[PDB]
């Protein structure tokens, strides 16, 4: 059902043309359905929403003090970006050096939900593993969710291999997002500590 624990969840949305405008709406929906099943609060589950192409568009920050309802709305209002490339390396790097530059909330697990539907050019993957290892060194769990037949499988397998908690969810389409939404929310919640 619902998650009331200490967690810092970062939604990373593939912003490539690999996802149609309509498909990206399904993705954004799943993200909002998720926020609905999380206890969004600075004392419980904090959320950040970022859409990624060549760069990152941060719509919600973990420190953003806005009513959950407001945050779910902002999420639903995430502009579609049909870029030819959505750099996973760049988002993890951005997640690493920007989002988790400092760990202000050690009492919370950190999960980077990497919703991916594309595959960046190899030259962009050069430091891929190094970024995933850097995240691991801040204890930021990286959960990869493959969507569609273009989601970088190599990188998905590679992320699972970097750390034991990095579990992957490989879906055939944004339509499976809803069917698995609950198992995904459960897993992420179970990687978080309840609070006393």
């Amino acid at each position: 059902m619902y998650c009331s624990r200490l967690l810092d969840l970062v939604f990373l949305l593939d912003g490539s043309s690999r996802l149609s405008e309509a498909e990206f709406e399904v993705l954004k929906a799943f993200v909002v359905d998720m926020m609905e099943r999380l206890r969004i609060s600075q004392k419980w589950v904090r959320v950040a929403v970022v859409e990624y192409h060549d760069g990152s568009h941060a719509y919600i920050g973990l420190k953003d003090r806005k009513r959950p309802s407001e945050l779910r709305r902002i999420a639903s209002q995430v502009k579609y970006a049909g870029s030819q490339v959505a750099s996973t390396s760049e988002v993890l790097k951005y997640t690493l050096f920007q989002i988790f530059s400092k760990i202000d909330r050690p009492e919370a697990s950190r999960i980077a939900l990497l919703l991916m539907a594309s595959q960046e050019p190899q030259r962009m993957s050069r430091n891929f593993v190094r970024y995933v290892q850097g995240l691991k060194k801040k204890k930021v769990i990286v959960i990869p969710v493959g969507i569609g037949p273009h989601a970088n499988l190599k990188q998905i397998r590679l992320i699972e291999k970097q750390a034991p908690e990095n579990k992957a969810f490989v879906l055939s389409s944004v339509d499976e997002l809803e069917q698995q939404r609950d198992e995904i929310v459960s897993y992420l919640c179970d990687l978080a500590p309840e609070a006393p």
Epitope: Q122, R123, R126, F128, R130
Partner: antibody, heavy 122, light 108 residues
Framework: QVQLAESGPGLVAPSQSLSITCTVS????????VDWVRQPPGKGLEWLGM???????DYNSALKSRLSITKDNSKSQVFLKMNSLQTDDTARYYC????????????????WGQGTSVTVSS | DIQMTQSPSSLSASLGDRVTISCSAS??????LNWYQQKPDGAVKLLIF???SLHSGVPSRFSGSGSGTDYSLTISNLEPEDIATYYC?????????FGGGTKLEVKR
């Protein structure tokens, strides 16, 4: 087995361009990358750029975007193209294989070619 | 550009000698260092990669070590065919940069 052979112009007038084809053998260009390294006379080695198995490339910013590396997987050939060559671009140019395996962060220049000398003067 | 420094450019040794070539980096390069050999006839070959792994067919007299900013290549017993120039190269950050090189010279 693994081989790499250069075929260059030998000579190049200033302002002109250098075109070198690297004929590789003993491996598939979809599996490995290919780098270009040059050595100015009486000087050390210099890394120019490379082209991954998928075709993406990486260039040495110092070349002021004068370099282009493309290839033809079927013809096991990688083409280097450099614009506006100056005298100080005179050097022996080698095409070198490299794993281009970001999975293992493995980019060693494991197998080099004999190289080709390039003299740039009027 | 990470600057790779190989202090001695010329290194006199005697066959049988144990030789050590040093390479230092302008910054921490997390053991992302390779060692290359260019024989007098111009041939270049990779000897050691990732600081200490020997490349296929490379004799065990060659060994590499180091971490952080200081690395080195060692030839346990110098063989004649080992007379050549040695270059270290970092792959910590693009573009890849080589050291100035160290040419082995025979003592007489």
């Amino acid at each position: 087995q693994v081989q790499l052979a250069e075929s260059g112009p030998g000579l190049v007038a200033p302002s002109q361009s250098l075109s070198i084809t690297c004929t590789v053998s003993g491996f598939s260009l979809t599996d490995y990358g290919v780098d270009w390294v040059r050595q100015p006379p009486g000087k050390g080695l210099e890394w120019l750029g490379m082209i991954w198995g998928d075709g993406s490339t990486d260039y040495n910013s110092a070349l002021k975007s004068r370099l282009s590396i493309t290839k033809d997987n079927s013809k096991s050939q990688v083409f280097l193209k450099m614009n506006s060559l100056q005298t100080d671009d005179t050097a022996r140019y080698y095409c070198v294989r490299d794993p281009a395996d970001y999975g293992n962060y493995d980019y060693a220049l494991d197998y080099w070619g004999q190289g080709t000398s390039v003299t740039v003067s009027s | 550009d990470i600057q790779m420094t190989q202090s001695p450019s010329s290194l006199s040794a005697s066959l049988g000698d144990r030789v050590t070539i040093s390479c230092s980096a302008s910054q921490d390069i997390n053991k992302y260092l390779n060692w290359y050999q260019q024989k007098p006839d111009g041939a270049v070959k990779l000897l050691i990669f990732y600081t200490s792994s020997l490349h296929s067919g490379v004799p065990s007299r060659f060994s590499g070590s180091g971490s952080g900013t200081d690395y080195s290549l060692t030839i346990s017993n110098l063989e004649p065919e080992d007379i050549a120039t040695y270059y270290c190269q970092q792959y910590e950050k693009l573009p890849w940069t080589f050291g100035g090189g160290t040419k082995l010279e025979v003592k007489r």
